[PDB]
Amino acid sequence: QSEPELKLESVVIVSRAGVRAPTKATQLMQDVTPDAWPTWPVKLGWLTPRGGELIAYLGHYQRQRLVADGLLAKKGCPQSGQVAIIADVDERTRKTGEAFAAGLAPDCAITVHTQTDTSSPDPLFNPLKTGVCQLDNANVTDAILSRAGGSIADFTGHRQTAFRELERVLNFPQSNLCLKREKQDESCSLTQALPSELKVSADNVSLTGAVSLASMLTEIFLLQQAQGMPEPGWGRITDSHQWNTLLSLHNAQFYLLQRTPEVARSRATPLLDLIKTALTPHPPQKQAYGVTLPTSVLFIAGHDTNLANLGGALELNWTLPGQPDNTPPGGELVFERWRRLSDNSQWIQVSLVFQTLQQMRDKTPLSLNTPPGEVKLTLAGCEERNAQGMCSLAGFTQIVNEARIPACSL
Numbered sequence: 001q002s003e004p005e006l007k008l009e010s011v012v013i014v015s016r017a018g019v020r021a022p023t024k025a026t027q028l029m030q031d032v033t034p035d036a037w038p039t040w041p042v043k044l045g046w047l048t049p050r051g052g053e054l055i056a057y058l059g060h061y062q063r064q065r066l067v068a069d070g071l072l073a074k075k076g077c078p079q080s081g082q083v084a085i086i087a088d089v090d091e092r093t094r095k096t097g098e099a100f101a102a103g104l105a106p107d108c109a110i111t112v113h114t115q116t117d118t119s120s121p122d123p124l125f126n127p128l129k130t131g132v133c134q135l136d137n138a139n140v141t142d143a144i145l146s147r148a149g150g151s152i153a154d155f156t157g158h159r160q161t162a163f164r165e166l167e168r169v170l171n172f173p174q175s176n177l178c179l180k181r182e183k184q185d186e187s188c189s190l191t192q193a194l195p196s197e198l199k200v201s202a203d204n205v206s207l208t209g210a211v212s213l214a215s216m217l218t219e220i221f222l223l224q225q226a227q228g229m230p231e232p233g234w235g236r237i238t239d240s241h242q243w244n245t246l247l248s249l250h251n252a253q254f255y256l257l258q259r260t261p262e263v264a265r266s267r268a269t270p271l272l273d274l275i276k277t278a279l280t281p282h283p284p285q286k287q288a289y290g291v292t293l294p295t296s297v298l299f300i301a302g303h304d305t306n307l308a309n310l311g312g313a314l315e316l317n318w319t320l321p322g323q324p325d326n327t328p329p330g331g332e333l334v335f336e337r338w339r340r341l342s343d344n345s346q347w348i349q350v351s352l353v354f355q356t357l358q359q360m361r362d363k364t365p366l367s368l369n370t371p372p373g374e375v376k377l378t379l380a381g382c383e384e385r386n387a388q389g390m391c392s393l394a395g396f397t398q399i400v401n402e403a404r405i406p407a408c409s410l
């Protein structure tokens, strides 16, 4: 029987938090629709129990997957430290780490380590906001505008079809924002009523107006769907095409603010350092978060911006068949180090593991038989590859060292 020529030696999963209630409920959100937003079973921004179950499924899947690759034992709790879990201080990320452990090894109580000070943000997930490093305002401004085609106006102008789809879903024409508008000489328009401007500072970047609103609203519609609510978008979202059109507004914002290299590299450096050190073979030692690296499996509960920052920084591009959100709740950026038995050389494979929107809607349990979606990624900047398209450890290490911003390391 043909035997595998590669042996899995280490896995690093950067995961976005699972399904959660929208993070805010502003007046603007109510003014763009005459309808009422459906309420959620948990506080704003918190993980819903269904979201935890969905993450638990991925945890269950990963356990089966890793067992077949012989990295984890089929029975019992993983050895001490064999599995390490790190999470951002947010309630949803902490709970996502807990839901993953529960699914990976039920009743095994794998600790979910976070920064000790839980009332302060963790720079690992955003060194910009905590002041670890700064963005070059002038350079970032030019890079974002450049990728926008010169202006936000031209950017949004190319996505009016998607904006009109959102307006339709919101029944925008019959909203307070529309009715109480004075310049009623022209038709009501989200992009016109809320001009979008690029804001750039040393610690942050943002798009005001319709761009950021549309990006948040469409994500909420996705959240309603994944949460299993009766009629997302008030029943006005009836087919896959509409889902894609709507979410494209969401992916569009991330393309500008989170994938742009001038922002991504800085914002992803701490995570790049962690990932590299965890994937690089070396003597174990209690490190950051009280975790010992390297180890078999490291699961990091982060956010969608983290996945996008890492994609931009590593030049990893992807689209997820069945999932309109490129960085969906529970989505996992998976890094694996495989050793080639023939010569003991080290290789790194990157992929994006995720649940399709329907698998979230139907809350379908996962397993090797019913696996979640998975896309094998290709590091666009890697030259030295093996038969299976993986990048050599040296190649990967070169890519990370050139991408990271030293000034942003922790």
Ligand SMILES: O=P(O)(O)O[C@H]1[C@H](OP(=O)(O)O)[C@@H](OP(=O)(O)O)[C@H](OP(=O)(O)O)[C@@H](OP(=O)(O)O)[C@H]1OP(=O)(O)O
Residues within 6 Å of the ligand: 016, 017, 022, 023, 024, 045, 090, 215, 216, 219, 302, 303, 304, 305, 306
């Ligand atoms: O960590 P927070 O301070 O609570 O900020 C959150 C978080 O963004 P980050 O990646 O910067 O952490 C959400 O991302 P997830 O944790 O869900 O992965 C994002 O939600 P979306 O981008 O998916 O919509 C949301 O933004 P939003 O206003 O659209 O809810 C945003 O909140 P802020 O805009 O206030 O920073």
Ligand SMILES: [Hg+2]
Residues within 6 Å of the ligand: 111, 112, 113, 114, 289, 290, 291
């Ligand atoms: Hg800890």
Ligand SMILES: [Hg+2]
Residues within 6 Å of the ligand: 277, 282, 283, 284, 285, 287, 292, 293, 294
């Ligand atoms: Hg280490």
Ligand SMILES: [Hg+2]
Residues within 6 Å of the ligand: 250, 304, 325, 326, 327, 328
């Ligand atoms: Hg996202």
Ligand SMILES: [Hg+2]
Residues within 6 Å of the ligand: 219, 250, 304, 325, 327, 328, 329
């Ligand atoms: Hg998202």
